[PDB]
Design a protein around this ligand. Sequence first.
Ligand SMILES: [Fe+3]
Ligand SMILES: [Fe+3]
Ligand SMILES: [Fe+3]
Ligand SMILES: [Fe+3]
Lengths: 382, 381
Amino acid sequence: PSPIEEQATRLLKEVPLIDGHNDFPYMIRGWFRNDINGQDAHLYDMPIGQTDLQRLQKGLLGGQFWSAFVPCPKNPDKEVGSLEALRQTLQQLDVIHRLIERHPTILQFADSAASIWSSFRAGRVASLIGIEGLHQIADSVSALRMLHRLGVRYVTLTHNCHNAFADAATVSPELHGGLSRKGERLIRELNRMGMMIDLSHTSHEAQTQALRLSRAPVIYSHSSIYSLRAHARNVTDENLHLLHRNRGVVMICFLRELLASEADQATLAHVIDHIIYAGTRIGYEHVGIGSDFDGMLRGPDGLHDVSCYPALVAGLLERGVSEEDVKRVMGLNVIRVLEEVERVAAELQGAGEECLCDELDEVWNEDIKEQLTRERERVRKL
Amino acid sequence: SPIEEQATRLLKEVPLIDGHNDFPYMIRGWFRNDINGQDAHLYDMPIGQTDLQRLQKGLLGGQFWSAFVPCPKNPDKEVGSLEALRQTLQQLDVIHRLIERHPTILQFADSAASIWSSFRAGRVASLIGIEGLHQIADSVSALRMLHRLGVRYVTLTHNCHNAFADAATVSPELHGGLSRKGERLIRELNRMGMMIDLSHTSHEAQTQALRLSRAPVIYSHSSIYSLRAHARNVTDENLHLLHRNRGVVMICFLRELLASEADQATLAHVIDHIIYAGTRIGYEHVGIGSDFDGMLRGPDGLHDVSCYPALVAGLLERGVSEEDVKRVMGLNVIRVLEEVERVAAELQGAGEECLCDELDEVWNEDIKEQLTRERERVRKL
Ligand SMILES: [Fe+3]
Ligand SMILES: [Fe+3]
Ligand SMILES: [Fe+3]
Ligand SMILES: [Fe+3]
């Protein structure tokens, strides 16, 4: 082992490398249909995908935001499709929690900066949860708050579907031209409840608007740099600057199509170029790692699966990024953002800000209400 | 009065835990779950049998707050069932917000220990039940997430049949008790530590569930068939099977379940029903399950949540011992919840397999082949 490899191992022991996005729970849905009973051998050594419990240990990962992604609604009936996504979301959250609870020596649930650290002190992979698109809440802010209560700590505003709140990057034409009025109001509620905003998959204009409106720092859980590779899913220099002002973190993606114009030419070196570009221009306190492992068939050369994180840490150190800055990129930055999201929420909840409520149908007509008020006054007269 | 001072002392010593109150649905009806700036009204409600001042006044120790939503009414049954799941999350949301915005009065509880600490702190222990398996949209995954959101009992039906069990008030019978899915769900409910509630279910569904369950169950709001014949009241057969199950029948204040003429129902009738059950299956298997806010008008002397001291005094006046009154008030339902937790921990300790939803295949064989081909390429590196 070289001095740089031993340096990288020491860093991975000192601070948690917290990855922004991994779709292993969706692979469990694809391969096992969320039935993991008697499948331990396969969960430790998977016949498919970039994640399993042995390789997770091997790469020395400190924490993970596990994705509770479900696809954009396909159904011709938009009501069924939207509501179906909500039920599927609960299935994915259910399998994530069961995965964590059945493998407590490896995985430990975390929903805060303090719970990340205690998990890391115990030698566990801090296991957090994100949902990937506001299509997953079926237009219900109530449902969103219940997802927060189930352990969800970030919400990607869109996937590759426009929704009632925001525009996806990969869909043309634009629906809202950024955020809708409902989207703008939801940003306030996300800040109030302490839900981290994730701007990956959203349009450049939706990012700009959210970055101006948010009272808490946001993340890109898995996006790369537009100036190195022009793509609808990568972050422009304008939005990198607005991220700096927001105090947020861009978690650099391993998607080959986001790193190079020819996908088969993408490499570990390209991921490092993107980290260094962002770190140099907006500071290493605003850059993270957001693999998107299991959101792709094949990774870059040298970042093929979750065992490869030591090569990334070593590669950053080899380019002259300081230990303190590498530690920031590994996980301290995303911990800070989560910490600030909590603090903003506690501040707004302490001042007693009104929560956003769903628009409900009336269930009682005026005759029922009159009967109720008449009954109440009968009781008052007793 | 000596008996009223006795009643007050008992209410201070042990928590009176009521089995069922639909105040959250009244909040949905009246405020549409928008309680911002509505404290004055939540303390002094212009409608209904529950508000925060009267809740204090009656000295209630704990409450299972109902997250009820109506049976699906949509002709498109897929939309209707999924709609009920979304509404359930709305009701769980308003219950949690109600508790969180009034912490001097209400404290969330999900266990025997959290009930006691809430009661020690002078709070109404605030638990949650859902009223009908229509609320889970045929998803056992959803049910486990409702448990994680704080739900601690599930009424198997409301006033509609579902895929798991038959409701009492709907004829003809669909499953003739429990379905095959229903039988399998009982095992999962026991495994996860969800208390089974048999109110609203058919007589035969009760009998089958009472034989199958490995944990004690409740009736969160049902009365006695032999005193008043009704599809919603518990037969002597099922009272005996409840005894064997070690469960608790929480006596209902619904006028229609206490007397043949609803306007004749009284506090005395509720006490007759408690004493009937307590005499025949023991006072350790009887509780109080008002169903306040599941009705327009209560019985004479039990018009709202302020009236619990009159019920406690009335039981003592009829010769029910302090120890037995304390059991009926709340110790029995605390025991059931305790035993439900213990059965769950025991089954989870033995590593029993959880019930999984039947999912659609999402990858065709071409995608699966590409994935295994990719995995083997990685193994060769
Ligand atoms: Fe993803
Ligand atoms: Fe993605
Ligand atoms: Fe009810
Ligand atoms: Fe009811």
